[PDB]
A paper describes a structure:
IMPDH is an essential enzyme that catalyzes the NAD+-dependent conversion of inosine 5′-monophosphate (IMP) to xanthosine 5′-monophosphate (XMP) in the de novo purine biosynthesis pathway. As the crystal structure of Mycobacterium thermoresistible (Mth) IMPDH (GuaB2) was elucidated during the course of this study, the modes of binding of seven compounds to Mth IMPDH were also analysed by X-ray crystallography and docking analyses performed for three others. Computational analysis of the Mth IMPDH (GuaB2) structure revealed two main hotspot regions, both of which were located within the NAD binding pocket. All compounds were evaluated for structural analysis and co-crystal structures were obtained for seven of these, namely compounds 14, 18, 22, 27, 35, 37 and 45.
Replacement of the cyclohexyl by a cycloheptyl ring (compound 14) reduced both enzyme and whole-cell activities by approximately one order of magnitude (MIC90: 31.2 μM, IC50: 0.83 μM) while maintaining target selectivity. Pharmacophore analysis of the binding highlighted the pivotal role of interactions with 14 made at both hotspot regions identified. In the first hotspot region, all of the analogues made extensive pi interactions with both IMP and A285 (A269 in the Mth structure). The compounds 14, 18, 22, 27, 35, 37 and 45 were also able to make additional interactions to P61′ side chain from the adjacent protomer.
Author numbering:
A (entry chain A), B (entry chain A), C (entry chain A), D (entry chain A): 15 to 291, 316 to 369
Write the structure that this text describes.
């Protein structure tokens, strides 16, 4: 084997990230303004804009969830707070009209009680929220939830980075599979644990397991430009989950921070020391971006342009677009 | 598939840009001073120097077009101004002697009226000027123009980045095909839309569709050194269109700008916020370079050297030169 | 041959280093806190933590060796000092309880006398400590030691970077093979001699020769993050030897250095001019890190996380994990 | 074709430079101090140290040539000066004992008269000194010289970067072939003309044409570390020509320059504007390095280390060593 040893499976794949590829233009009759940006968040729930906000305590509380839903997407309420408080945020969102909202749960002992309280509060989507879903306890939580509240609530499972992991969540009954182990902007898992999977390759692999079963893939983490959203969907994802890109907005939790005459907001990993109080995230800053509505408009504008270039009238068509792989020189 | 999924066509190609390749020397009897630099701009029009200036409002108005033609190349007048004004610039160039000149038109409603006014003003080349020519409206404009004014005016279509797109323009009747989706120095399409195609690969693909029909390819965008002009022609292009390399010249529109004791001129994308008033270009600065005549001399000097090294007595011979692909270490 | 010449064996392999790969997650029932981190240092000696400290005079003297053993690993006492002094450090470690300790010897004339003095002092592991073990004098020293004191003392040989070299040490009777020619943080062999072998590939190759004979591989050099320890073990190593990561600790030799308001300690190659008094190492600084116990806890924490992600209940299982190769864009 | 077009020969090779490869250690009985560093400069002339100084006016005049010969290598006197003056420098070197010396000639009209004057002055090696030897005028000069003064003087031809070019010089009668089109530290040919060939690949290709005819290859340009000398010889070169590495020495032409409290010397391309008075070189600075004797000692020390690691008792053995290719991450 050219890279060493005698086992060709030891190095299993060549992993591409977003910066490794570009979308190829294709024959087009599609005007960006007329493209249909709607897409499946789960088997049953279709969003007008294929974007959801991360379940992080510097990204999504009630204010963000409301703004995301109004913009045509959805928020996923973080779970780094008491059950009663998270449930009250669900109620707060549902009081602001017929707005979709999701909420994160874990797989701990209090996870089941948290999920039932969220159901009682009227939540539409429960996100079983882990860093590694390929695990009996996670698969069991997904299955138990689906069998118990599945008629009324859609159950998302994640995160995965391999085909087999995605397959396991599908068999467990997930209504959507969330992809991303290691790609987050504030992630240190790759240097702390040495574990990860570049996100374009991870999406391609997850989609190979989910699409034949009609299960939507959520691309979670590593998106830094509006162009990355188009790439994620073209790789086969149905929606993208965003942390860093939304953390700088007025609707995100937290105050403005002034450093060197410039405005920022804090953005921290849920695995950072601060969030937990062996960290796998950092605490950082992102530039202040203004209102969420305007950020979403710019992000969707980029996606619409990609749909024009690729001749994709719908997200389903964009999922069939082709890539070109680029070199380092294509900085 | 090593990069993910089960579909080998999902990632269609490995895209090389100019920095990825070098020209290999070959047996030579050619002195740089004696090389013939003439090349086809279109099926009928041959230039003494294979260079045209970009149709941008910080690069080509009448003064630039006149200087380019005198230097043996051609200018393409930008269209970010009223029809009457653009037509008056055509007249101004034709009044300065028997000088070749081209002018950009769009595919909007006013595009046809613009084209006829340019024809009346005496224009030699009409450039159907879009970011994505693989589109019924663009192909129809090219065809209508060719059938209507084709005997007197050469019609250029662009831009394309794929073989099929170039083929479609050829069938539509284009007299030259312009290549470049995403490579421009001031371009943000790659980060906004996630769309693009590295330019050496794009030229190779376009040429595979155009050369068998005797249609010249114009390499448009991403050229930053005189050496890139040689590479573009060796990949099979017949001419190169330059923006950044000519924007710093005395003949370009705009004033000198002094920052930190150094001289610059503004250079902005036609898709920048400033030009349009979702932007796909930026507004920037380029160093002031002095007279156009001298810049062209230096650029052509580099091309002549390449022709000496490769034993290319003509541009047609240079189009048959070979490359070596380099690694990152070859910075 | 695509890279030149007619001999496909001239460029023998594509060498990967730690930054070239990530560990893929796999099905897991393993809790990080419950993972078994024990591993073979040699055929007979198993450590609770698979880490040993480098035999360098800015890393391991008696204080470090004691702390490493207490933390569940081991120290290898450097040999840049008189035989009597090194032997006294062995005694000092053994006086602090039933603590494992190793000590470096060379292959010079005084090497044999040094080894016997270390044996008399009660050493558990002798490390035949060279930059290139594939050499008759090194193989002879390993063999002589094994045959003479092998019943009481384990003999480590190194360093190697190729399969054949590792094979030769195995046949010579080594109880463990140490891998690393050129990867050290303070190493200049790669620029001075142009010699080296990227460490993931070197480990894969050494393991292919050692594992079928039941001989553990020690990955030595180039480890800069806790994640690199997981990668080294997953490539097939049984332990990792650390220099830079431990040189900043309270237990390492040397004083604190203050530069620009920040605390550092000196860290220098044993091939640096300072250590020898043609250098193949530099003298540098590393940040002060505090107590060794805490550094080891953080390093092992990272390893435990990797074992959770990969479903590895033991180091033997981690050695069967798979990689994904990443590109430059995966910075 | 994956990179574009339908012609697999368009991109002819993947070109490696020195930074792309490392030498693999191999079984060794060779002590660095005992390695034989002698090598053929030409078919007849063997040097004790396989190094020659560049024919540049900031590197080699009489003082450098004398010092190089005394160190066991050779200097090649530059030709950017009157014939009488260059010839007087030859005389000056021969007056300092039985010291080998070479001198550069061109292929212009005055080239023949220059060569005869150098022969009369007692020169040992004539270097036909061009940037592209694959040319009838260069091949004719080599042949004419060999047939006219070949019994007394060795004739070097260069530069080449391809197998066919090297073959042509061999057939012309060259006693050594010099390799390097574009790799020089002060070279801008790659950005001006877009022409070049990475040096490890260029050496491998030239050697494939020269070695079967017993003609030594001189690796010229791009060497920045002592380790690059080992790599060049291992790729099959017999000697290396150095510019930048020797330009900082006391024996090089020019004065010391003080900038920001540090000592430098000027180093400029023979194709720089300053040397010619379309430039293909720059004028730069290199750090002051002290006496040549000491620089050579350090360079040879590195080579000796490489010979120890690779088990090469002679340069002929080193030419049979193997490489490993490294990635970008192996910075
Ligand atoms: O429960 C774990 C264990 C994972 C399973 C394997 C054993 C290691 C621990 N966590 C807790 C959550 N995360 S995280 O907050 O950083 C995280 C949050 C969501 C998405 C992630 C995607 N990739 C990395 C980290 C992510 C860290 C690790
Ligand atoms: O009309 C469009 C639409 C393109 C078709 C697909 C839908 C998206 C919009 N424009 C308008 C012009 N450009 S541009 O000015 O930036 C532009 C000018 C010329 C050459 C380009 C080459 N590559 C990128 C941008 C370029 C932006 C996009
Ligand atoms: O004895 C030698 C000879 C090596 C054999 C081939 C001939 C060259 C000399 N030494 C002495 C020790 N080292 S070192 O201290 O830098 C060193 C220490 C341990 C691990 C090394 C791993 N890779 C590089 C250097 C290393 C330098 C060279
Ligand atoms: O005579 C030429 C022509 C070359 C043949 C093809 C046509 C172009 C001109 N020169 C003159 C010398 N050089 S140089 O001084 O820069 C030069 C000096 C030696 C080694 C070189 C190696 N690679 C690049 C430049 C080098 C520049 C070009
Ligand atoms: O602490 C952490 N370490 C690693 N990943 C995290 C952490 N916290 C959240 N994440 C994940 O990173 C995603 C956000 O990534 P981003 O959009 O690139 O910032 C989130 O939706 C999580 O999947
Ligand atoms: O705003 C923009 N975004 C992307 N491409 C542009 C824009 N404006 C002009 N272009 C194209 O970029 C070319 C100039 O590229 P440059 O020579 O690299 O600066 C132009 O000829 C256009 O094809
Ligand atoms: O001077 C030197 N040059 C090259 N390698 C060295 C030198 N001194 C020690 N080493 C090796 O580098 C290892 C430490 O590497 P590190 O952990 O990356 O700093 C040591 O255990 C040695 O194998
Ligand atoms: O002006 C120039 N441009 C390109 N190459 C040059 C020039 N002048 C000298 N050279 C070549 O560069 C070699 C020195 O390269 P260096 O050792 O990397 O600095 C010289 O021996 C020449 O072959």
């Amino acid at each position: 084997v050219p890279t060493g040893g005698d086992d060709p499976t030891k190095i299993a794949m060549l992993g591409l990230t977003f910066d490794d590829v570009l979308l190829l233009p294709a024959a087009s009759d599609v005007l960006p303004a007329n493209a249909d940006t709607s897409s499946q968040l789960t088997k049953k729930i279709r969003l007008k804009v294929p974007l959801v906000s991360s379940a992080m305590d510097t990204v999504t509380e009630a204010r963000m969830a409301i703004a995301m839903a109004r913009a045509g997407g959805m928020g996923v309420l973080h779970r780094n707070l008491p059950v009663a408080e998270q449930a009250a945020q669900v109620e707060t969102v549902k009081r602001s009209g017929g707005l979709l909202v999701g909420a994160a749960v874990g797989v701990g002992d209090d996870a089941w009680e948290r999920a039932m309280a969220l159901r009682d509060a009227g939540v539409d989507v429960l996100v079983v929220d882990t860093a590694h879903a390929h695990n009996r306890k996670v698969l069991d939580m997904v299955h138990r939830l689906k069998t118990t509240v599945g008629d009324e609530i859609e159950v998302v499972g994640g995160n995965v980075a391999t085909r087999a992991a995605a397959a396991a969540l599908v068999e467990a009954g997930a209504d959507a599979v969330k992809v991303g182990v290691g790609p987050g902007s504030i992630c240190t898992t790759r240097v702390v644990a040495g574990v990860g999977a570049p996100q374009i390759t991870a999406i391609l692999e997850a989609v190979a397991a989910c699409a034949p079963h009609g299960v939507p893939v959520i691309a979670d983490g590593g998106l830094q430009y509006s162009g990355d959203i188009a790439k994620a969907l073209a790789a086969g994802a149905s929606t993208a989950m965003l942390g860093s890109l939304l953390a700088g907005t007025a609707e995100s939790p937290g105050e403005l921070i002034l450093v060197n005459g410039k405005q920022f907001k804090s953005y921290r990993g849920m695995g950072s020391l601060g969030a937990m109080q062996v960290p796998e995230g950092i605490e950082g800053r992102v530039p202040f971006r203004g209102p969420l509505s305007t950020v979403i408009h710019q992000l969707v504008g980029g996606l619409r342009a990609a749909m024009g270039y690729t001749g994709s009238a719908t997200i389903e068509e964009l999922q069939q677009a082709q890539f070109v792989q680029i070199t380092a020189a294509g900085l």
